[PDB]
Every structure is written in structure tokens, then in C-alpha cells.
Amino acid sequence: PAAAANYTPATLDQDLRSQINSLLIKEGHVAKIQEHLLHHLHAHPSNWPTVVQNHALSLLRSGEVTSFPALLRRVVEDVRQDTAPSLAVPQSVVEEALKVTRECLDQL
Amino acid sequence: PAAAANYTPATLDQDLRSQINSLLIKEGHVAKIQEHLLHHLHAHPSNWPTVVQNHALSLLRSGEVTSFPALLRRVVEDVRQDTALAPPSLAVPQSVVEEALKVTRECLDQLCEIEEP
Amino acid sequence: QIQYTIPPREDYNKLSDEQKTRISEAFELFDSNKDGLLSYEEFRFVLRALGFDLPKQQTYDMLVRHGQRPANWPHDQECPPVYRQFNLATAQALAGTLIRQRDPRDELRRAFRLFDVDGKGMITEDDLRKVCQQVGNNIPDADIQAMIEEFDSNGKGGVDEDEFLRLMMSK
Amino acid sequence: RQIQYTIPPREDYNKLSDEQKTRISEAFELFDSNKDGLLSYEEFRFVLRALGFDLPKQQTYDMLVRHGQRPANWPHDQECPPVYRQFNLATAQALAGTLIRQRDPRDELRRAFRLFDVDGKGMITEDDLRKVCQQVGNNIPDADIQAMIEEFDSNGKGGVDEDEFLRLMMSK
Amino acid sequence: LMADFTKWFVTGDGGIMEEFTEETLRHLLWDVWQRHQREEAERKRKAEEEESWRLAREHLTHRLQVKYFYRWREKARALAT
Amino acid sequence: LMADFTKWFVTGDGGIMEEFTEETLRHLLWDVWQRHQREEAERKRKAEEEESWRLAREHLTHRLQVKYFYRWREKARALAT
């Protein structure tokens, strides 16, 4: 019930029509939660959260950030620098995301 | 008894041999002790010792005097001068003096006699 | 943001000798290292000694704006705000500004809390007596009785915060 | 006969350092609870004891009679006793100054030795240095304090006695 | 190929990886945030127990009490006539 | 009359009244002296324990300990080379 239509290949490709369509259909018989679950359970083994927490802690300890939203913005900004101890999410769970999302996206 | 020498009357008189002699005779077969008793007993009623003590206290509390001998010399001088002026004063009341006259008189009457020229 | 800059002294100069002496006193107290320099937390304490319980944000702003690097730090490398220190000048200027900016009511409220330790909400004769015992000087109970009765407008047996402040600010 | 009420000289107060003068003013202001800028006899005694002076009553009394000023409330037509006289900041400053400048440097050190060694053991050990470290608040590595003891322990007794403490604290 | 589409879908901008990492960071950071708060409570409490501070505090207390007590008593004495 | 002689003897210089007053003063004054000593011990004791002095003392102790401790440690590290 879903046609790729050359699938908008580039990782940077900015398509929201297809994305909101697929996401909307996918939300029915929700899969988002399955991905989230599998990912956390597969996210903790690599030892990333401790890195993140220690960084956030340092940020709070220095006193540079003094509110949770600011801490969130600061840290999300920091992790975002995947391209640059790295706060980048391990490639393993990315491959896992690829697998499970592919599997759950194959059905549609 | 002891024959005297016409008593050298004025209080400030000079003869000291008769005085020490009389003291010598008096200490033997002691009578001095009676004087001490009668005096203490008659000295405490006028309430003099408390005044003396309070003065000594003030002197010690101020810190003006810091040794017992100095305290003694000071208080002795003080009573010396108050006693000088009298005729709260630390002068010894006249009562006990009169008492001294009486008791000393009786003791001396028993002890000695005074010849007449 | 401009950074490492020395703070202005204008708000420190208009102080009296007592105050300046109190600042220098606090500094010298919390200056255990004797180097004429304070750590960040030592500076926080120095301000807390003057009666200022500022939030981390404000002291951190002070830290980045007016914090000087330590000597041991290699100049070829960047220094984080937290590792910076305060000379006497910065502490003086900052404390001065803080003091002249301080609301006059704060010290009085603090004091009211010092007098009324039980948190009853008012200062009674007993409290004044305890404080008298703390000061060391003995005052006749008529005076303290008058200290309460003259300013008690409710006949409650004490003086509340409002009355304390009002009487303490009154000429 | 004795001269009385005279103001004390500042010559011995002037050559002091800012620290000393400030500490004196601090002590004065501390024990000046009435805030009248004047001290009683005992307040002044405490002010001197705050500087670390345990003078005998005789000396402070001499100071009192020589440099004690009558209070204002006192009727000027009658004599006031020495004990009722008070000390302004100037007198306290001058007297304290003389006292500080005349004091030998060993006194403060002996006192300090008693402060480090509170148990009266007769020597300062590593534990004491550790306690003092805890008192000050700063944490120093045990190698330093171990070196603070060992470098100056000439008996191998496990501490530093008074003599050694003074000798080392006075050393150039 | 579906694999390419899912690749774009998961690691693209507004991808699943972004929403996920954002969410997990939100909750994780909240946890460590509360942790830091508790830690600060304890650190402040222990920091307060320092002696230098106790001295500064006591000195201040005494000074204030003196100042405002005598000021107060002065006002009282004034009004008492 | 004997009374005149007694008068000379008692109210004279070196009289019994003089020696008496001296002695009684000696003993009475010694008593009040020891008394004063004990009173001073207790009064000083009570005067010491209270705040103002305690603040001055604590301040003194701290300042001294700091000064000579760090001075000492300086000597030590200096010697360690």
C-alpha cells in the first residue's frame, strides 16, 4: 500500500510529504514505540549514556547551565556534532534502527 | 609584784624599756590573751571587720594592690589616717579602746603596783 | 562576550571605611592560601560572608566577566571559567557593587530572622533577653519591655517583621 | 603622687603594618559593643587579650591610671576613681602599638606551638598537622605534612618539639 | 530498494534517529539533572560545615545582632521619654 | 592612778592597741585575700566562656594556625627541594 517512487535518496533530502505520509500510516499499528524500546535496550550496552551524563554533569557542575531546558538544548546541540570522547550515538544502534525500521517498513 | 617608775603619762611618751619590760612580765603567766579575746568579742559587734574586708576587697578588685604585704601596708596606713581624722571610716571605734583601758587596767592592777615619791 | 575584564570601582569608592574594612576582612578570612587570590567557591563564600546568597548564574557571570586565570596555567591553552581566580581588586569592586545595589530591607529581614530564631513570626521579650545574653551586656527588663511594648500595635506580646522593619528604617 | 589622664604616644603605633592596625581596630570595634567609641577597663583588657597579651592586672592598672580618661556622664567637679575611667580608640591603639612593638617574636610562636599541640604532649605530630589542615579547610597531601614533620625532626621521635618549632619558624 | 528508503527515512533530517535521540536525551538529562540537584544539596550541606564559614557566619550574626539590638533599644529609650 | 599608766601603755606607740590592730588586720586581710583569689578564679572563668571573647579567641586561633601552618609547609617543601 506504499510506493517508494525513487525514495528521495540523499540523506540530506528534504521531503516531508512522503515522510508525513509514511509516518502517519505507520503510526497506525504504531511502530515508533517498538523502535524506541529496542533502541534503548540496545543503546545502553554501548555505554553512551554515561558519557552523556558525565558531560551534562560537568556542564551543571561548572554552573554554565542552570536550568533543565538549557541543559537539554546545550547537550542536544553538543551531541549533534556527530560529524566532528564523542557524544555521537554508536553506529551499532543506527544499523539496528536500519534493520528494525526496514523490517517494520517492509510490511507496508 | 613590780615597783613602777611614775608611769611616764603622756600617750606619745618615749620610754620603751618599761613598755617591753611590762610586756615581758605580762606575757609570762600570759594575760595578753584575755585582752585579745575581750577585744575580738567587742570588736566584731560594731561591724568594723566587714568594712575593713570590703575596703581590702575594693583595693584588690581594682587591681591597685597585687600582693598581700602591699595590701597590709595600705590598709594599715588607711586605718592609721582614718583613726587620725576621726577625733564609712575604717578607724577603730572608741568603744573597744575604752574596753582596752578597762581590761588592761585590771590585768596591770593584778600584776603591778606604782610607787610614790 | 568580552571576558577577563576588570570590574569598575566607582561603586566601591563611595563606601565608608567600616564597610571596606569588612570586605577586606572577609577576603583575608577566606584567603587561606595567602596568595591574595580566591577560588570560585571561596569567592562565593566571601560574598556569603557579607550576607549575599546569590544564585550560581550571577556569580558565574561575574566569574566569566571578571575572572583571571591562575599563574600555573599555560597561556597557549584556553582556560575554563571555573579554574579562574579573583584578585583583591575584583572582589572589592564586585562586593562594592553588590552592596550599593543591595536593598536596605534585606539585612533587616535577615536580622529579624536572627532575633526570632524559633520562627514564631515575631520577636518577644524572651528572644530579646537571649540576644542580650548573646551580646554580653545586661539591660534592665524595663528597657526590653519598652522595646517590645512601644512597637507592639496588636498587644500580641511581640513585634512582627513589618513593625521591625518600619521601626528599624524610621528616622 | 602620680601624673594621670595623660594621652599615650603614637610613635610605637605608627611603624606598624596595615594588618596590625586593622587587627587592632578590629579587636577594638569587636569589644566596643556599646558602639560609643569607648571601652571599659575589662573591655580594654579583653581587647589586649584579643591581641594575645595576657598581661598582669598591675600593668593594665598602670595603663589605666596613666592613660585613662574620665567619662562624660561623670561630674567634672569631683574626682573619679581609676576603675571608672575608659579608653578611646586612640589610647587602645597607642598602648597596643607599644605592646606589639615591644613584644618578642618567640611568644606568638610558643602560643602557636600550644595551638598545634593541644594535648600538651610536648611535640607536634602528623595527626596534629592533619587536624589543623582540617581546621583551616584546605587539604594538603600527606607527603608534605610527613615532610613537615620529618624534615625538622632531629630525634626521630615522630614529631617536632617546641625548641625545633621556634628554631624552624624563626629561621631565615 | 526499501533499504535505501528506510536509510533516508531513519537518518534523514527529521529522521527517526533524531526524534529518538532527542527524546532519550530529554529523559536521561532529566534523571541526571535531579541527581545533580541532590548532589548539590549534599555538597552545600557539607560545604557549610567548614569552620572558616562557621566563623564568618558567627561573626556576621553577632555583628548584626549588636547593631540592630542597640539601634532598637535606642529607639525604645527615645520613645519611653 | 594606774589608769593613766594603762592609758599610756595601751594608747602609746607600740601599745597593745597598735600591735592588736596590726595583727587583726594581718589575719583578716589574709582571709579576704584568699577569698578574693578564689572569687577572681571563678569570675574570670565565667567571664571567659562567653561570646565576644570566644569570637576574638577563635579568630586568633584560626589566624595563627593558618599563618604558621602555611609558613611551616613552605619551609618543608623548600627543604624537600
Author numbering:
A (entry chain C): 13 to 96, 136 to 159
B (entry chain F): 13 to 99, 136 to 165
C (entry chain A): 6 to 176
D (entry chain D): 5 to 176
E (entry chain B), F (entry chain E): 1090 to 1170
Please quote the paper that reports this structure.
The TREX-2 complex integrates mRNA nuclear export into the gene expression pathway and is based on a Sac3 scaffold to which Thp1, Sem1, Sus1, and Cdc31 bind. TREX-2 also binds the mRNA nuclear export factor, Mex67:Mtr2, through the Sac3 N-terminal region (Sac3N). Whereas protein transport is generally facilitated by karyopherin-β family proteins, mRNA export in yeast is mediated primarily by the Mex67:Mtr2 complex or in metazoans by NXF1:NXT1 (Segref et al., 1997; Braun et al., 2001). Mex67 is a modular protein containing four domains: RNA-recognition motif (RRM), leucine-rich repeat (LRR), nuclear transport factor 2-like (NTF2L), and ubiquitin-associated (UBA).
Bacterially expressed ctSus1 formed a tripartite complex with ctSac3CID and ctCdc31, and the crystal structure of this complex confirmed that the appropriate Chaetomium genes had been identified. After refinement, the model had a Rwork/Rfree value of 21.8%/27.7% and excellent geometry. In the C. thermophilum complex, the Sac3 helix also had a “kink” following residue 1,137, possibly as a consequence of the greater distance between the Cdc31 and Sus1 chains. The helical elements of the folds of both proteins were fully conserved, with differences concentrated in the loops joining the helices. Density for ctSus1 residues 99–139, as well as its substantially longer N/C-terminal extensions, was not present, consistent with these regions being disordered.
